[PDB]
From a paper:
Among the most extensively studied orphan receptors are the chicken ovalbumin upstream promoter-transcription factors (COUP-TFs), which belong to the NR2F subfamily. In mammals, the COUP-TF orphan NRs regulate many key biological processes, including angiogenesis, neuronal development, organogenesis, cell fate determination, metabolic homeostasis, and circadian rhythm. Here we demonstrate that COUP-TFII is a ligand-regulated nuclear receptor that can be activated by unphysiological micromolar concentrations of retinoic acids. COUP-TFs are the most evolutionarily conserved NRs among all species, and within the NR2F subfamily, the homology in both the DNA-binding domain (DBD) and ligand-binding domain (LBD) is extremely high.
Here we report the 1.48 Å crystal structure of the LBD of human COUP-TFII. The human COUP-TFII LBD was purified to homogeneity in a ligand-free state. There is one LBD molecule per asymmetric unit, but COUP-TFII forms a symmetric dimer through crystal packing. The structure contains 10 α helices that are folded into a typical three-layered helical sandwich seen in other NRs. The dimer interface is made up of residues involved in hydrophobic interactions and hydrogen bonding, with the majority of the hydrophobic interactions observed between residues found on the N-terminal half of helix α10 of each monomer, which forms a parallel coiled-coil structure in the crystal. In the absence of ligand, helix α10 bends at V373 and causes the C-terminal portion of α10 to collapse into the lower half of the receptor, the region where ligands have been found to bind in other NR LBDs. Due to the bulky size of these aromatic side chains and the dense pack of the binding pocket in COUP-TFII, there is no room for any ligand to bind in this conformation. The kink in helix α10 and the subsequent collapse of the binding pocket of COUP-TFII allows the AF2 helix, which follows α10, to bind in the cofactor binding site of the LBD. The N-terminal end of AF2 is stabilized by a hydrogen bond between Q393 (AF2) and R246 (α4), and the C-terminal end of the AF2 is stabilized by hydrogen bonding between the conserved charge clamp residue R228 (α3) and two backbone carbonyl groups from residues M399 and L400 (AF2). In this orientation of the AF2 helix, neither coactivators nor corepressors are able to bind to COUP-TFII, and therefore this structure represents an autorepressed form of this orphan NR.
Residue numbers in the entry: 171 to 193, 207 to 268, 286 to 407
Write the structure that this text describes.
């Protein structure tokens, strides 16, 4: 913005404000997973810029990234992870490290919200209509993150690069494993990527 430094800060505050949570019958692990997914989509509907993208671009971005946002939200919310002391466990084991590494870096709420924006605004999605604009938005998100981290963590000079190096691992987590682990009772069967568009068009608040 036109005081760049303060407007990058205002951005992060808006990314934060978009989060539904802080972010009787006690959620079970699969209800917890559905909330982590729905909250990703609701957060995306309420951040700056995303909702103004053409709808088909919004769908393309979420279809690719939902699993990475899912992982970010699962780490953020400390979703219980070894859990069924029933499960596989190659599946259980590979979701797990990524969560554990983000918690190990003590990623803060701000950093989570930036990382989710950087993940969402990816020009890797198939079928985008305005790739330059999405890139610009990712550049803004990364430039916001960099500024935050240099100012909040001035004695951890490598922190920015460590946070960015979480990204490739997100991109390798398998969508099918996440589905198999958490979403089968809810969905079968059906790949989440095929239901994302309905999800985005559902989903409540005026805010």
């Amino acid at each position: 913005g036109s005081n760049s430094h303060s407007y990058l800060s205002g951005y992060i505050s808006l990314l934060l404000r978009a989060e539904p949570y802080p972010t009787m019958g006690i959620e079970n692990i699969c209800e917890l997973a559905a909330r982590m997914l729905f909250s990703a989509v609701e957060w995306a509907r309420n951040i700056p810029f995303f909702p103004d993208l053409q709808i088909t671009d919004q769908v393309a971005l979420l279809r690719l990234t939902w699993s990475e946002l899912f992982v970010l939200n699962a780490a953020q919310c400390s979703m219980p992870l070894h859990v069924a002391p029933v499960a596989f466990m190659d599946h259980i084991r590979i979701f797990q490290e990524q969560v554990e590494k983000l918690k190990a870096l003590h990623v803060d709420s701000a950093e989570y919200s930036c990382l989710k924006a950087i993940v969402l605004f990816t020009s890797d999605a198939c079928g985008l209509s305005d790739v330059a604009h999405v890139e610009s938005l990712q550049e803004k998100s990364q430039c916001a993150l960099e500024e935050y981290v240099r100012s909040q963590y001035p004695n951890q000079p490598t922190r920015f690069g460590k946070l960015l190096l979480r990204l490739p691992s997100l991109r390798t987590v398998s969508s099918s494993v996440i589905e198999q682990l958490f979403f089968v009772r809810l969905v079968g069967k059906t790949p989440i990527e095929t239901l994302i568009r309905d999800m985005l068009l559902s989903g409540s608040s005026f805010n």
